[PDB]
Design a protein around this ligand. Structure first.
Ligand SMILES: Nc1nc2c(ncn2[C@@H]2O[C@H](COP(=O)(O)OP(=O)(O)OP(=O)(O)O)[C@@H](O)[C@H]2O)c(=O)[nH]1
Ligand SMILES: Nc1nc2c(ncn2[C@@H]2O[C@H](COP(=O)(O)OP(=O)(O)OP(=O)(O)O)[C@@H](O)[C@H]2O)c(=O)[nH]1
Lengths: 431, 431
């Protein structure tokens, strides 16, 4: 085939925390290349191997495989210190020779220190005095993307090129920022100095990302895995704007983040949690602010890993799911946390939205509208049984099998994996 | 097929002005839907029908077909006045009932008046006193994209929703801009008033863009045409940054600009000019600052339609072409302006780049490097004959046929069309 190898993609289908990491780790085992095409939220990911716990943010989970190549695409924004700070932390815990299995596209944009600063203050103004919240902060993701949009930002390739031309551009950049932000403090020579140090440290891992992926996809058959960032509803274009990240968290982001054509996209897996969760303020049609939600919240341990803030919980919402599929064209699904529902007598599933009495066939773009929809539910009987031990389709009880079919049928996408626990063994592959 | 209809895409393979419009107009004839997925540069496009000349910028060329639906995807940034100003201009020249054949995704971002202003001054600072140039201006494209990145911008859906919540957000936005830009003048109540007027005027043409395209692609077989903006080397991620637009001008942009999955992408045509042209400063490996370039410049009428500024001309450059294919996965090519070369005795074609003596297999990301490459040429004999009258492969002379094969072979992509003139008849379809 002239096409060559097609990449396998894992994307979140809801508002994140679906359990993508579990699907990625399971697939990263026999993958030749494990990559990240979009930075997104740079949310954290914990991986356990041979008795060691690792924490990755910018680094692909697959960096664990010493037999695979880890690749950061051009679509990921990178903060040098944060990167090495992350590399060093995991290294001193077991990760060895990572600098020999990590490749970085030279077209990736750089998140400078002042970006994080401009991002740290914007929040202490936008929502520091009874203001509305939006996305993450102190990471400087948005600001970096803003610089990219303005064609004012700097990339890895620029850093590794003539440092004289880089310095002049960096200064100009920081200058413009101090203009738009008078209360912004920038240790110019200090940062510029720390960067030149970073340039040399990173240079051996940088390559032309487009040529690198093209070669990998057109040489002998290879297995490339792309771990999607965040989820569909957190997508800059398609998520519940403005409560979204600054990058595409959907399938198109694979093409723009790696520089590969659509024909080189193969399996696209949608990770669907058996119920819905969301972080922060915003419309949440199926939200359950009652005993059910507390139960899903508790049994699912739905709270920020670091802050401990509880996540909002609600019933599975098919309108979100179908929308995510329209955009991503999932070829298969990974239904996770089915076990959380082991305890319920009946489970509700939102099947459609009604607006001013009438049923609408689309997922509303604006918040005000999305906040007004009336959910139409379909009550299903529960299995009232422990599924944590199931390891095959036949092990699941009749009402649980029906729950899975219900998802497949209404989404038009087959379920390939059913998650019944945290351990990688607690995953059932249906085909 | 579960996939449904696959869209046909036309993309520029070089630095723009390749002749995409000719390929689009030829295809828009029997297309059910003609759309734009990314605004990009909002460059102009002239179309002639029944004795009337139209000028489209935001409006898809296919709006000419009264039997087709014109669609502006979520990836296009829109300036309301500019839009109606464009609609009205063409309407008073023949375009009638356009408001009945035009659909607009409600997820499309809005280019407000102050965006254009912040963009008009940034240029009168960045390169108004011996400064370097970059992209277009006075359009406020970049600034709009910056607002998008910050999740601070407003979209069509927001405008059509509760105007009270819109006004508060608009004011907040304009406020932030006056903070970052003290010399920025904003007639808040004046603009906010003109918008409410715009909201009602545009409301009847707005729809949920994701649902609209999904339906069109999964209902009975339809023919959707996507006219790409600008070209590959003007791509924000993949073009010769910083000399590029603020949006993806490549195939991935189709997915992110329309919200359709990769499997719904069918034919992707790369428009390749028989020689290379570029607008503005920047590295140009095959540039010919001599009699050849003057000749290509003159015979090809390579100058800005409005400003009359001459465009830089050079030999066909295969490194740019192959790069564009790595990223876009062209299924077929449209080789244009072959006739411009009718007069040469021998034609040169850059086949590879050498760097510090060695041949590099990739297209350099950074300008400084790209400016240092040494081009390796392949001299080919010319046909020295008038091809403007050719209408089939057999009409082309032997050296011209070879020129076409040379392009196909070294790009690995078949040539489907050969352009030998301005008239739509001056196009040869090879298969
Ligand atoms: N009980 C149960 N827990 C699960 C299942 N699948 C995943 N989890 C847990 O859910 C939590 C979510 O972690 P991840 O798998 O990293 O999910 P995520 O997709 O990375 O979320 P973000 O990357 O932050 O968007 C982990 O603590 C998992 O152990 C499942 O089938 N059952
Ligand atoms: N002689 C000749 N002129 C051509 C040919 N194809 C296109 N042109 C002319 O080239 C010019 C370019 O116009 P378009 O076809 O709109 O090109 P473009 O792709 O829209 O460029 P941008 O949209 O600005 O990036 C027009 O004046 C065309 O008539 C060809 O085969 N031969």
């Amino acid at each position: 085939a002239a096409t060559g190898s097609r990449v396998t993609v894992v994307l979140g289908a809801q508002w994140g925390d679906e359990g993508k990491g579990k699907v990625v780790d399971l697939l990263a085992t026999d993958a030749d290349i494990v990559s990240r095409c979009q930075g997104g939220n740079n949310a954290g990911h914990t991986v356990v191997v041979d008795g060691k716990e690792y924490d990755f943010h910018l680094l692909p989970s697959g960096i664990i495989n010493t037999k695979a190549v880890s690749f950061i695409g051009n679509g990921v924004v990178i903060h040098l210190p944060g990167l090495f700070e992350e590399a060093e932390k995991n290294e001193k815990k077991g990760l060895k020779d990572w600098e020999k299995r990590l490749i970085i596209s030279d077209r990736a944009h750089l998140v400078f220190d002042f970006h994080q600063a401009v991002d740290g203050l914007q929040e202490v103004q936008r929502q520091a005095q009874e203001g509305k919240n939006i996305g993450t902060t102190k990471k400087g993701i948005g600001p970096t993307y803003s610089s990219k949009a303005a064609r004012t930002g700097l990339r890895i390739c620029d850093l590794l090129s003539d440092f004289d031309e880089f310095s002049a551009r960096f200064k100009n950049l920081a200058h413009q920022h101090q203009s738009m932000f008078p209360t912004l403090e920038i240790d110019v020579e200090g940062q510029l100095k720390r960067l030149k140090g970073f340039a040399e440290r990173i240079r051996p891992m940088v390559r032309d990302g487009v040529y690198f992926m093209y070669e990998a996809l057109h040489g002998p058959p290879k297995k490339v895995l792309v771990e999607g960032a965040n989820a569909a509803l957190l997508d800059i274009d398609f998520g519940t704007y403005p409560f979204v990240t600054s990058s595409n968290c959907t399938v198109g982001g694979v093409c723009t983040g790696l520089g590969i054509p659509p024909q080189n996209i193969g399996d696209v897996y949608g990770v669907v949690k058996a119920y819905t969760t969301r972080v922060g303020i915003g419309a949440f049609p199926t939200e359950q602010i009652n005993e059910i939600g507390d139960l899903l919240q508790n049994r699912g341990h739905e709270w920020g890993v670091t802050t401990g803030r509880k996540r909002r919980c609600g019933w599975l919402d098919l309108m979100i799911l179908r929308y995510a599929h329209m955009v991503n064209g999932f070829t298969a699904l990974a239904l996770t946390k089915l076990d959380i529902l082991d305890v319920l007598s009946e489970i509700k599933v939102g099947i459609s939205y009604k607006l001013n009495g009438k049923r609408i066939p689309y997922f509303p773009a604006n918040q005000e509208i999305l906040q007004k929809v009336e959910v139409e539910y379909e009550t299903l009987p529960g299995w009232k049984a422990d599924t944590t031990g199931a390891r095959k389709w036949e092990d699941l009880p009749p009402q649980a099998q029906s729950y899975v079919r219900f998802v497949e049928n209404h989404m038009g996408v087959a379920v390939k994996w059913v998650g019944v626990g945290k351990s990688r063994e607690s995953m059932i592959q249906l085909f």
